[model samples]
Each structure stands twice: as C-alpha cells, then as structure tokens.
Target: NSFSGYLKLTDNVYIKNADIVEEAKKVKPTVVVNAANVYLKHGGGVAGALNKATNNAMQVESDDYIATNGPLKVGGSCVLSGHNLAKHCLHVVGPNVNKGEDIQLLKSAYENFNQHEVLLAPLLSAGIFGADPIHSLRVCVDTVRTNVYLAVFDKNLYDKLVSSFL
Candidate 1:
C-alpha cells in the first residue's frame, strides 16, 4: 500500500497530494525533499515523471533544484538533467541501484547544501545493502539536514523507530 494510493504522513507532511505547495507553506520551516522518485516504481522512474510531479506539487521553479538520473545502466535511461526541481541533485555513481550508497550520497548532498530543516521520505528500496530505516535516520541526523520529517507509509514502523532515536 505504499504507493497504491496517497497518504499524508502528518499534518505538516504529506504524499501524493496535488496541493503540496500550500501544505509546504503551512509547514513553514520545513524543506520538502522529494524522495518519491528515487525508487522507480512508486512514482519516479528514469523518465523524470516523479520529478515533474514533485515539482508540480511543490510549485518549485526551474532554478529551485537540480535533478539527475542514477549511474546504473539497468533501464539505460536517464531521468532528468540540470537543476530544474529542488535546490540541487548530486549525480553520483552509486555502488548499487538500491543500496546505502544512495542514502550516503543524499546525506552528502544535504551536508553540501548546509543543514536545514528537510522533509524527505525514507529510502524505500533504494538504500544500500546494509541501509535500514534506523541507519538511514542516523546518517541523516549525523550528516544531512536536521529536523527531518521522513515520509513513510508504515505508521507502526515510524512509531517504533522515531522515539528510539530520541
């Protein structure tokens, strides 16, 4: 049910909603990072469909961010190029298509961007071999931006893990 429909993870966080800009504005001090397309199936793939959807939802202009496809040749497809979505997209050749390197790259990107209040989704299936939710969270907290609201479909998992970190 992760991508079957759409669900708002929190009053200040949401997913698949058409009105992402208003919600983002309401959240204020929150930076919405689009991780939905990181995975190919849920929404974003190599076609940049998810990127477009995210941009449309967040109402981000061309200068807001950068977008790039993965280095793997699985689909032999490139998602999107240039900084047309968020702030920037660090294009790196990850170790695996779905593994921890992706998470680390993202963390590095956040660090490069300077720690800010970021809202992103946990790595659905794109994390490295050893990358789990908690590990991802730790990486984010340790390197990426702070005050992150990671969107997840599993509420129980969220409740189970979020407090343990605290």
Candidate 2:
C-alpha cells in the first residue's frame, strides 16, 4: 500500500517521515525550506544535501547574500533559487542547540512562507541541533500552511510520530 499515517496540519499540508530530496523530486515543490544556521553554511544534514543537489550554487549565493546583508537571525529566513529539484529553497535559521528557542524560531520560519505554495520542509532542529523529534514535529505541524509538505528523514522518528500523533 501507499505510505500512510501522516499528521495532517491543514487541508493541504501533511507531515510524514520521508527523504526531503526524494519527496521534492516527486512533488516538484515550488519552494523547499531548509533548516539553516545564521551564517548560511550548508555543511551538514538537510542543508548539506540541498547544497550538493544544487551544485553548490545555493551555498555560494546564500553566502554572498548573508555577507552583504547580515547573518540570518533565529526566526528569520531568506530564499535562494536554481535547484534542479525545486524552483527555490527557503533557508530559515533554526534555533541553535543551546538556544531553548526551537518552537518560536520554527514557527516564525513557517510563517515567513505563508504566501508561498507547495513548500517542502524538513523537521527543523530535529537533526544536529538535538531538539526532541516529537516536539519539533508538533511545532512544524502547528505552524505550516495548507500548501506545505513536511519531509521527515528519520525512520525511527517517523514511526514515533505516526504512532503518537497520526
């Protein structure tokens, strides 16, 4: 059977544990949201994969943009284009490991894309930042618009989310 047990966030938005890049390929989303750092460094996790998929173009452009403008503060975001998988990538600065600000920052990031449609987002801070997977997923489910699609990459987390909330 097809993949089941999504946490329905809105009429259109749903959360499931799957590979973000693979999901993007299937949906061809207009925008994909990246859990990013203040400096726009695409060194690991979703950021690194996105950078590689876009041929490092996103990193180069994002870096230049950050340099000229300023670091993307927590709860802030910026967009970059030229991804073969998606038309654009929205880089939102998630809270750092020690910040104790995951929910607010993630909420702001999702809200920042209220005007956009067909967004593909990973569970922010659930990876390297050590935010609780269940908590982060709930925040994402709460904040995303109807047009957003959440891609959860961890199988264990996926099962937990499915069992707990779906």
Candidate 3:
C-alpha cells in the first residue's frame, strides 16, 4: 500500500510535495532545514529559494557566520534567525551525491540540526545536486528522529518517492 498524500515514515516524520515556504506558514515549523553547499552561496536551488523567501535575512546571517566560522564541511550546519514564516533556519552542507558516501553524508547532515517540534526540509540533493529522490527520501526517513516535513517540489519525483515507500 502507498500513500496518495503525505507519507508518514514514522510517527513524527512525514513527506509531502508542496511549496516549502507556503507549507511552513501552515505548520509554523520551529526550524527549516536548508540543503546548502559548503560555500553557503544562495545563487540558486533550495538555498536561493530560502534566501528569497526570508528576504535575504538567511543569506545575511549565513554570510556573517561563514565569515567567522569559515566554509562549512560536508554535513556541517549553521543556524539563522528566520525572517519570514519559520522561526529559525538550519543550513546543512550536503555532500556531492556523485561521491560514493551519499548516505553517510546525508545522515551526517542531520547530526547538525537541533531537535525541534517541527522541522521542514527540502529533499536534499534531489534537485541541483542530482541525487536520486528515493535515496534522499530514505536518508530523510532513516535519519530524522524529530517531527519532519519534507517539501518535495517535483511532482514526478514526489510520486516516485511515495510509491517506493509504499
């Protein structure tokens, strides 16, 4: 059996295909997770979307932290005060999935996040980084212990994820 709507991976974890920012408004997630690169550049992808939605507050905060802390290693993270809908944002540097340690790196990314009542994450490495959506979904399901909502923007990818889990 497969879920047509949101797929509940655990009692606390769920997956859905929706606009992450818009969905964040409904749930009021304590933290929004960003699948960012080590450079913390907000040029495009989910990082750019998050930067734009937060009115560049995320970028400003991220830049300040990076200036002081230096470039993030793969699986490292930084927290920023949220400016828009979410209360806070956590930026995690995901590994290049083309590398063999995709799962290890993905799991490591989760280690950097603090536990929150609700957290929103984009399907990490499923977009610009070109990781398999199913692989990303599994990483999320296996690693996220807190209540999580995965905002999957691509419909085909979303369908595949749901079906695979089912």
Candidate 4:
C-alpha cells in the first residue's frame, strides 16, 4: 500500500506507476506536487482528480490563494493544505508546449517546488500540457531533490520513464 513495484533511482528518489494522491494518503508524504494550470483552477488533469479526491477542499483553498495573489505564472508555485493526503500540496504550473513554452520553462516549473521532505510528485506537464514524456521526466528526475517518490499514473509513460531513468 505504501509503494509497489517502484524503481529506485537513489536512496533519495523513486518512481512508480500509482495514484499520486492515494499513495500519499497512505504513505504520508510531507508534500505532494499538483500539476496545476496557471490559474490554479483545478479544472482538469491531475488537479481535477485530486480536487475530487479531497472533496474539492483543495480547490477551495486554491481559489482563496488566487483571490489573494492573482493568477499564478508558469514556473511559479504556491502551497495549499493537502486536505486528504500529504500535509501540504505544492502546486506548480509547467509549460504548455502547445502554447509555445520551451523546455527550459519546464525545468523551472519543477525547480519552483521549494518544499520537500519525503515528497510525492506526478508526471508533470506530460498530461494535457503536451510535453514529451522523456523530456518532461528528464527535467523532473534531474531537478528534484529531497526524498522523492514520483507516482506515475499513466502506465505508458511509467514504463517510458522507468526505462529512461533506471
């Protein structure tokens, strides 16, 4: 229930195909990464799923953050209470390649996660953002520090990342 069939990249890093939020609740990661849109809308993809899981409390918190700070920028982030999972949800926006953001922007997006202690992350930007799995994960694998576990939800990319990283 904690981590199953996970590939170890190092003592500090791991990768697996699992539900990011579900595993977080069971394992209690200090933080969880949410691949949110710039507006922190939680409308689709990872955010949408997580929002539903937490009974939309994450969305309410995010809405409050936006009301106070305005729309978030790519490579920028804010933390919200991980209402049903990790203690904190590190919300960050990655480049939407279809919208013309370059690879460097993707790197910065992962870089902005300033908080981590036994962190859990998803395969960022590789969903609806149109990022290539290899490139998207290369940046994440290279940049992430702390004790990290990447819960790869999409089975196709899970194999892709495990092969490339391990």
Candidate 5:
C-alpha cells in the first residue's frame, strides 16, 4: 500500500500509513523510534528494517552501547546514530506481554521520544509483543505529540488510523 499521504493533528503531529524507514530515508536526520527488546538487538520487525536501512550499523552501535551500559531496563531508552538514514534511532524497550514481559515501564517511556524535533514511530508493543493493535494505536495517538509522524505498518491499522484522523 501507498503512504496514504498524512493527516495533521494539533498542527504538528502527522499520522499516516507508511514505512517509517522510507519516511526517515527521505528526511535524513529525523529521529525514528525503534521498539526493541531490553538487549537492543536488531533482530526483527521495525528493528530489523532499521538495521537493514542503516546497513547493520544500527545494530553495531547498539552492540557497543549495550556492551557499555548493559541491558536496558523496560521503559528505558537510548539514542544511537542512524548512520546516514536518520539523525538518531531512538531505541526503547517495550513490554513483551504474553512473555509477561511486564507497565509503568511503557507509561513513562512515551515522554522520551516527544522531545525530538522529528520523531517517527510505529505502534509500539503491537508487533511480536502480543499487544492489541488498537490498544497500541490508542496509546500512540493519545500521547505522541508535536511534529511526530505516526506510521502504521499494517494496512488495517493504517486505514484505521487515517480514517480516525483524516
């Protein structure tokens, strides 16, 4: 599916159905948020594509960072160089539910990404984490603010987001 343009909310927030990596590629230096595990490994989903876009450098940087700081705590975050694709990759560990991955963690997490000038994020916790897609979408829409780009990867989620906003 196409990017489906975008719908602006509160003048600065933009929501759309598009690939977050592609969006960041066009606007290199935009800080894109990556929903990662506590280890910050670039294994799959958003992390996988981001690692691919940056030619695996994201993972290497993450490796180095983790080697230094140890595994990130849930609700914790760190920023990594996005190579040439983005200004930074904001890595945040979301709760992995069915794994009983555990919530105050996520509640405090959203504030970190909002500070960036341009933040691109997907619906966190919905993918591979067993969270309800709509729940993820609501949390994202409710809290994400100012010049943020909400890119939903799933078509149903995308359509749902766009229709709700556009």
Candidate 6:
C-alpha cells in the first residue's frame, strides 16, 4: 500500500507519533517515510528506522535536513528531488512544505503522471522542519489536500506520486 519509511524528522518539527502511527496503520503501507530532527527526542528518525525494519527495506539516507533547529537561516529549504534514470525522486524543502508548496508538488505530480516518477523529501531548516509540529502538520495537510490517495505512500516514491496523477 505504501513505500518503505526512511525519511527523517527534525526536533523543530513535531508530529503526533500516535496520529502518524494510526495513519500508517490505516493506510497499511509497505513503509512510512519520516523526516525528523536527529537530536530531538520527538524527532521521527527512530520511527523511520522502525518502519524500515518492519517493512523489510533498506534505510536509504538519514542526514541533517540542514542546520540545527532554530531561527530561519538566510537560505534554508527542504530538498525535493527526482530521477528519470531511476524510478522516482521528489524532494521538497520545509519552507515550501509550510507554504503548501509540498501539496502543490504533490498535485503537480499527480497531474503529471505521464511525465516521470519523482521523489519527495522535505529538506531541513525549512517549513515545519524548522518550526514545530502544528506547522509541520499544516504543511503536510496542504501538500496532501483533497486527494487522500496522494497521502498514500508507494514503494517507489516517484511511482506513487505519478500514479496519483494518472
């Protein structure tokens, strides 16, 4: 139903583990990607690891989204990536996530299914990743607006997003 979880979260961001877990359970996803601050206890790094083991997938990369959680630096944004050579790569910065651009990207992804698969990773030091949970959820909700299917995760992040468009 979903791809393996490997994304990390930062301390600045906050997400209800119970809510996330509950959502994951409901989705019955193959994995749950998380992006959390590594140092903060509330960070989602551990959750990502748990999903990786439970889902039987490789934990791709767990690095600092950017700098430590704090005031917005001069140029801080989450990373949104994609790969045509491979399956997918859709990375997004925290700021864009907060601004609802993440959702826009999701929308674009769904609309451009025929285009290519893409990955979606929220870079640190941006959006809720640099703020708190409320903000983080806001960004997430906006990113996944309307289309509950987009909320679903697929093994290949790009493939999943593109599928939504189709």
What lDDT tens digits, residue by residue, belong to model 1 across residues 47-145? 134346455433243223223433232211122222333343222222233533444454544342233444433332233323466655455456543
TM-score of each: 0.41, 0.85, 0.86, 0.90, 0.86, 0.29
For every model shown, the clashing-pair count is 8, 0, 0, 0, 2, 40
Q: For candidate 6, write residues 96-138 as lDDT tens digits.
A: 3443333323333222222322222232222233443333344
User: Which model scores highest in TM-score?
Assistant: 4
Candidate 5: residue 132 Cα off by (Å): 1.6
Q: What is the lDDT of residue 42 in candidate 6?
A: 28
Q: Compose the digit string of candidate 2's lDDT tens values, residues 15-49.
A: 77788877776766778888888889899899898
For candidate 4, write residues 83-130 as lDDT tens digits: 878788899889887788765788788776536556788767787888
Poorest lDDT segment (10 consecutive residues) of candidate 3: 1-10
Off-target runs (Cα >4 Å) in candidate 4 are 1-5
lDDT of 5 by residue, 46-117 (tens): 889889888888888889998999999877788888787777788878787867965445555666767776
Best by the lDDT measure: 4
Where's the lowest-lDDT run of ten residues in candidate 6? 77-86
TM-score of 6: 0.29
What RMSD does each model have against the real structure? 9.4, 3.1, 3.7, 2.0, 3.2, 12.8
* Local error of candidate 2 at residue 114 (angstroms): 1.7
Off by over 4 Å in 6: 1-27, 30-33, 36-47, 60-130, 148-166
- Sort by lDDT, best first: 4, 2, 3, 5, 1, 6
RMSD versus native structure for model 1: 9.4
What are the lDDT scores of the predictions, listed in order?
A: 0.37, 0.76, 0.75, 0.80, 0.74, 0.30
* Candidate 3: regions farther than 4 A off: 1-5, 98-103
